[PDB]
Symmetry: C4
Subunit: 329 residues, 4 copies
């Protein structure tokens, strides 16, 4: 059986064509950061505190005031239909039942309407790639607000697409809203915040300088991320960049992260280092590829179970008790 | 032939079903700490002192006042019957003949009575997982005292079981024996004061990895600490036990004896733990490997081999006795 | 298809005999530096700056006052004929069309005349291994000046050939070819018999960088000869730092050794290099598709530089700073 | 063809039985130091100085006042007959022609007389393992002085033999010769005065790895030190010899000559040892690889190759003579 996220990865590959699998991996250039996102987590040492009463371990928390089952959410990932026919519809249902945040990609296989319809009560954010046509922009935002999305995610590390050698060697042809065959800057944010009442979360920040700019522009949150190493390669591992970003923000706004989260202690470490919660990219697709909706739900349940387990073992009764004292410096 | 502990590991695998072998390995999650426990030992560099008179190398020492052949003992490990039919009985006999301390697991294949009967004079401690009932607890403690156990080991790093992927993928089914395998904790510091106030036996806390918990251990007046990460079978990605040993020893400042387990496989590992402040080391898996290969004779051979190696590296490094093994031996 | 330099490397191997492939690899002794040249680049972490207007990314720059398409040029490499019949002629044409500098080896398969004839307008430097007779030397220099070469490259890390075990085990026999006491003082002389700027290639230390400036040369190419000479020296990208720090911008500093992807170029520039040079990749390009191969290798690397500059927030070569490097 | 020492190693293996090959490898216990001796050399970065006049590169030097072709000599290694029938005789001839120092083992396959007879003018030292019987000791020493040996080497890191797992698993049986292989020590610092009262030959201590032992060496007035860990065949997990060299050299401060062995395989290794303060290096296994491949010609080729490499890296780095090889060459 599939007992951890790594098993879902190994199994997901088989149910997918090399073309679709390589796209889901899609490391950029020499693929240094893709591997580093994981190695960076494995290097960190934990300092457990035993003999504490751990009879009741609470895994709940909140992001942007909204409560969720665990600090484990779904990061935006395009075309879920390459993994499972139902695409985002299955993902939405699983996210709703798991009661966590599902960030829908700007390039989903199904329309936002179809997705929302599949899981009405789901907590969800919308990742929108801004275009030159701001009429499309404000209309997409209003459309999102109308559909119940509770936040807008702006990914900033993709002005252009990363260089994924595998996709190029396979000459693309993404065959699962059809698959599509940027000049956005800090000032453009001022105009976006004027057309929406939705909190804005900037995704892709890796430095304290950009973190400072993010606060000067009054955004509601930051997702520390290097796009899973699919964009600019040889940058810091997201879990490492998390430290300086957290230190610069000083708790003014919520900071999250993604990239390489695969096991319970990775979540534990991100939280202890200052993140409000983590987001999953590829694991969600692995879940879909294996068992559709049940697959996504299983990945989420497994990671949550592991967090619950390492919190118990390390001596953290609740997310609030997860501190940097847990981290070996 | 089997000439070192590594050979017993390689050979042990073959006489055991993948199910049983995976259970004995049982690294948790990504299995980082399991490997690190060994790598951490290999990184440490020794500074030998030559041309000293090493005609008489003494390997003896004491723990809790009791004398033993070498600072090499048996850490608690459940269900020995999955490795050899005789289970803990063969282990007890080997431990008694080697004259070292045998810590018996709370989940042994045979009853304490049968185990003690097999080796009456054996020096032994008892690792007891405390339960809700303060009657089952005190009765187990009294039963232990009655049977001759000279110490109570309280393992603190297992409030819940570690996530061993292999066992899960093999869906368990632990089929070894007598005392059946449990199909499948709220104990805190205050419960100690209570346990301590109901037994006279010295108490050794197993699983401490931090100076903070080492301080708490002393405030609660326990008699000893076994620095350990449960062989990487519990919370993974914590420090290697040989590395954690340092901050624990520094915090304790010699007030109480500090021991360790986790990755000890060769003589110099024992040497390094002692030079770093440990009173002695305990062996987990190697004992089971010994059982799987030759039963009682296997366990005895593993103990004799490690002892012979310690004796050899002590001779080579210039340490006439356990008392002469100091941190000067360690490259800082 | 071949989508990156690594692909050209893997494919190049097949179209060449082990003898020729080993010669193009030619790591010296234990081959430590050859690998380190790449590993040293991979270790460096980048600090991107997002949300800047990257609608117009300029990849152009100049070396010795001459403008080029990108800070990506061709380092001197002998006998191009072992990779493609046309040898340096194909290389020359490709370099001319890509509009970058092509440093021609002192041991080319074709004469300088034939090479220049193949690509008249090409920007090129000449790497000349000095010999004892100062007549031959000055005649070679005058011959170069006459042919249009805009700079003279002196390679200093090769007083004797490196110990390439592979070539020895294959007993040589380079069949597509020839079967030093030069010191600092000799420079003063060469400078008197030529008006061409002199670029020293192979400097790895700040001490030699100082001496280079005292002898008033026009440029330095930080290099370890691709790990083909003295092995176990620093990686060129690492040695770059102390050479740049000693030179303090007095003269242009370049580098070669292990450049294979866009960010490598980005990193050398952020660290102070004016531009980088490619050694083996050019030969891989020739081995695969001749002139088209070399051109593709140059275009690919250029496209990658353009992409990471866009991603990292560098609108032009002038905006590539050490703030980009994680210290 | 064989173009470097590595090739001789690869080829030597084939002409030898696993038994004999494993004995020549013989890493102790987990075999950490054996590998580290090489990796330690590879980590050091060189800083070459170009455009210097290297038309004349001198590779000569002296040890104990005696001049030699290059700072490359032969360390003591027992039973050369397991590699080539002629054993030490071939080695002696090759060493004599290469004009370097040949340290003969206390456990050679041939008698010192036969060895000396094979190469009369050879520069050579004698490594003698001191015994309980000092009559045997002074007679061996006098016998050595009589035969022309110019120095006595005392190996101090082998009071007992290292634990070579391979040999044990192969159950020994060393079958190579004349002087039979022994079927299988209490020497201390004070014994050095006794030895110094029976001989006038300079004494070189082999096996020192620490500044403490280096200080003691000087207090006992010996003539030289060979920094060595016995090729990782004795106490394992000690520092790599090239790394230990530094603290030994710093403690000695030029009072006596310091040499080293362990992992030297290529020209730059020799260069680095010299730059770090060693007077010269000694080769262990390489010499045996040479014998196994081509007997006398093999040993000579190994020596010529390493010498050629030293000459080459000296030329490239900008060192006109051994005297010009300085620590400025090393990246700190
Ligand atoms: C197939 C795939 C598609 C993705 N699509 C998007 C997208 O449309 N928008 C976005 O902001 N990020 C996208 N990402 C990146 C994720 O949001 C996330 O940054 C990254 O994958 C997280 O790392 P992980 O996969 O290690 O969890 C995608 C990643 C993958 C693997
Ligand atoms: C099969 C197996 C069973 C174990 N059972 C117990 C147990 O019942 N109680 C306990 O405190 N530790 C148990 N341990 C952990 C050991 O006490 C010890 O911490 C660890 O295995 C030591 O490491 P080593 O195996 O590297 O020697 C067990 C370990 C193994 C491999
Ligand atoms: C086959 C081959 C031949 C070379 N010939 C020369 C030469 O004649 N002169 C010179 O200065 N460098 C020569 N080099 C070295 C290059 O100029 C350059 O320093 C080095 O290869 C750059 O590293 P790279 O291969 O990683 O790009 C040669 C390199 C190779 C692989
Ligand atoms: C087969 C073999 C036999 C050896 N015999 C001796 C010996 O009798 N006496 C001694 O002092 N060292 C002996 N050594 C160790 C060498 O003197 C030297 O310390 C070590 O091998 C040097 O390392 P290298 O082999 O890396 O050069 C022996 C080594 C080998 C491999």
């Amino acid at each position: 059986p599939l007992v951890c996220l790594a098993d879902f990865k190994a199994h997901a590959q088989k149910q997918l064509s090399k073309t679709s699998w390589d796209f889901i991996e899609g490391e950029a250039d020499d693929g240094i950061t893709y591997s580093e996102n994981i190695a960076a987590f494995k290097r960190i040492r934990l300092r457990p505190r035993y003999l504490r009463d751990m009879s009741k371990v609470d895994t709940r928390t909140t992001i942007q005031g909204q409560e969720i089952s665990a600090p484990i959410c779904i990061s935006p990932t395009a075309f879920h239909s390459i993994a499972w026919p139902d695409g985002e519809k299955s993902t939405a249902r699983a996210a709703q039942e798991a009661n966590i945040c599902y960030v829908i990609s700007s390039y989903a296989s199904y329309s936002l309407e179809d997705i929302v319809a599949a899981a009405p009560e789901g907590f969800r954010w919308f990742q929108l790639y801004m275009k030159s046509d701001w009429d499309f922009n404000k209309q997409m935002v209003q459309r999102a607000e109308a559909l119940g999305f509770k936040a807008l995610v702006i990914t900033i590390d993709t002005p252009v697409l990363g260089n994924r050698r595998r996709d190029k060697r396979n000459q693309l042809n993404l065959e699962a809203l059809r698959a599509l065959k940027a000049s956005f800057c800090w000032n453009d944010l001022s105009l976006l915040q004027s057309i929406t009442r939705l909190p804005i979360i900037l995704k892709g920040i890796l430095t304290k300088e950009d973190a400072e700019l993010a606060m000067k522009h009054n955004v509601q949150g930051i997702v520390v991320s290097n796009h899973g190493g699919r964009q600019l390669d040889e940058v810091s591992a997201s879990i490492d960049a998390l430290r300086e970003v957290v230190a610069a923000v000083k708790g003014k706004i919520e900071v999250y992260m993604d990239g390489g989260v695969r096991t319970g202690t990775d979540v534990l470490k991100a939280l202890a280092l200052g993140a409000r919660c983590i987001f999953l990219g590829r694991p969600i697709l692995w879940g879909l590829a294996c068992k559709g909706e049940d697959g996504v739900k299983e990945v989420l349940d497994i990671l949550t179970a592991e967090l619950h387990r390492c919190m118990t073992l390390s001596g953290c009764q609740s997310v609030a008790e997860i501190s940097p004292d847990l981290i070996q410096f």
